[PDB]
Structure 1
Amino acid sequence: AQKTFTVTADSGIHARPATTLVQAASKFDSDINLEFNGKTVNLKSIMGVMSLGIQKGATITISAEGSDEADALAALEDTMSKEGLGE
């Protein structure tokens, strides 16, 4: 249901590479949430991901809970390494 990462992107999770990871979450129909430093807001929301300010080398957890978790937690991994964010 969840998959934790480590961001090695000099940019962190901002600009388009972030708008991308949020646009690739409004696709699925489950419930995805991002958790940084123990703070949790809807990973499917811009102001939520843009409010956090995920720098570089910051471990983050993608939590999916719905009728298509595995599918979500899977493509998001692609979306991450396809954007060069975390690993």
Structure 2
Amino acid sequence: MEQQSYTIIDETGIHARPATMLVQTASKFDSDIQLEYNGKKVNLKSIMGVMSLGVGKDAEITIYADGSDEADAIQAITDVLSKEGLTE
């Protein structure tokens, strides 16, 4: 039942670094985190979910973990999505 909205600048998006990160990070907790967009709502699956919503520069999102380690997820999940801001 946790959640966290953001505003990144990765005009490239969830590349090989943030993608592989969310895979292990999210898969670790196992809880389903629904990562939304300024005009969309899906799971931050990276494989396509994030691609569809487009996580470019200034990309606004809203994540929600609902499973078991839904809180711990938010923290480590940030570091992951936070990596996107380390680009442009």
TM bin (shorter chain)? 0.7 to 0.9
Percent of aligned pairs with the same amino acid = 55
Question: Which has the larger share of helix?
Answer: 2
Tell me if the contact between 2:22 and 2:80 (Cα under 8 Å) persists in the aligned partners. no
- Aligned residues between the structures: 84
In the TM superposition, what whole-angstrom CA distance separates every residue of 1:4-34 from its partner, at most 9, and x where no partner exists? 11102242x2431342343132221212011
Give the aligned partner of residue 15 of structure 2.
15
Q: Is the 8 A contact 1:26 1:44 kept in 2?
A: no
Q: Provide the C-alpha distance between the structure 2 equivalents of 1:22 and 1:77, rounded to a whole number of angstroms.
A: 10
Uncovered stretches (5+) of structure 2, i.e. residues with no partner: none
Question: Normalised by the size of structure 2, how large is the TM-score?
Answer: 0.76
Task: Indicate if the aligned counterparts of 2:6 and 2:60 stay in contact, CA closer than 8 A.
Answer: yes
Deviation at residue 3 of structure 1 after TM alignment: 0.7
- 1:66, distance to aligned residue in structure 2 (A): 1.8
CA distance in 2, matches of 1:66, 1:14: 23
Q: Judging by fraction of residues, say which structure has more strand.
A: 2
Structure 1 residue runs of 5 or longer lacking an equivalent are: none
**Alignment root-mean-square deviation, CA:** 2.1
- SS of 1:50's equivalent? helix
Q: 1:42 to 1:10 in 2, by over 3 A?
A: closer
Could you tell me the TM-score, scaled by structure 1's length?
A: 0.77
For the residues of structure 2 that align with 1:77 and 1:18, how far apart are their CA atoms? Answer: 10
C-alpha displacement at 1:72, in angstroms?
0.7
